[PDB]
Amino acid sequence: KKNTPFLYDLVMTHALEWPSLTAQWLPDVTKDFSIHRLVLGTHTSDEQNHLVIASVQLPNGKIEIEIKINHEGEVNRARYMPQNPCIIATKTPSSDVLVFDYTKHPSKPDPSGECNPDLRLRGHQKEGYGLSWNPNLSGHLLSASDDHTICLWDISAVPKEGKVVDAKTIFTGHTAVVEDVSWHLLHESLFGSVADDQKLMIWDTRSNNTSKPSHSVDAHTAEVNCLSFNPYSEFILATGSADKTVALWDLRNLKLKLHSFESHKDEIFQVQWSPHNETILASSGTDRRLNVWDLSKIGEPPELLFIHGGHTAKISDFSWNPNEPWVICSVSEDNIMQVWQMAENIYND
């Protein structure tokens, strides 16, 4: 707090009524400020949960809840569809995966608490976290579950008046809880998955065999909780683990870890590349820290650019602002949401 004026160009703190397990900036941006929006959720103790859209004023600081949609159970994860960001998929504490078009719901929820999702996606037997929309195939959604499977739905092929969709494909390569799943940015047929079986799997949707991946690799010495593909370097990705490390990978040679990022004091739950800078990656978890890494400083640890110490509880999720370089939203288990940007002098050196 004392050093915040020197460590940050922006630090905004907000206490939500209930904690959010998820955070994702919507891509739209609309005075000496602009309005940005976040997809958030609730995590309650036996009370009505909501899918939430919040607004944030950012300089060219007020945070307000714009929309609350009745949701059945806590929102494990919520992700918007790139081709139509009004469409949001959510992971529930039951098996169903839900889809909402927030323009077709009131801004104020009915106190009856009726969850009326636009689609209920069936296929899983248990809850999960991993959720990914295909940026090259509109409406193709991947989901990871504690039932050890990956489901795929094609939302573009659902009947217009249909409210329930069965999984198009179920991928059964893992032998334990599948923690995360992500499509490649460029190859419409490629996606990666990570699981408690300590493996990273690379899948080709053009393959006739849904029980065997294109590549299976022993990624970590503990559960693998997250993955992220580099949006500038098509062959590169990162994984985060209960190992307390982030691993760096090349799709052309997955049997050899390129690098291991070490600083976290506990389990890592989220890893995300910067949307603006190819060598920048961030990671978060149970140690209540969000680390920012710079690949270009490897060997000069030297690759640790910044440690965000604003949270005093486990970090559940974070999201890089797609419109404002170096702005991050991070959320923790103690109801705190932070919107922050490290000092320009830190990344300009």
Add this chain to the structure above:
Amino acid sequence: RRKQGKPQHLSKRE
């Protein structure tokens, strides 16, 4: 396993 059992309620309604 990934989430707390007793999420706390803060005294606000937004």
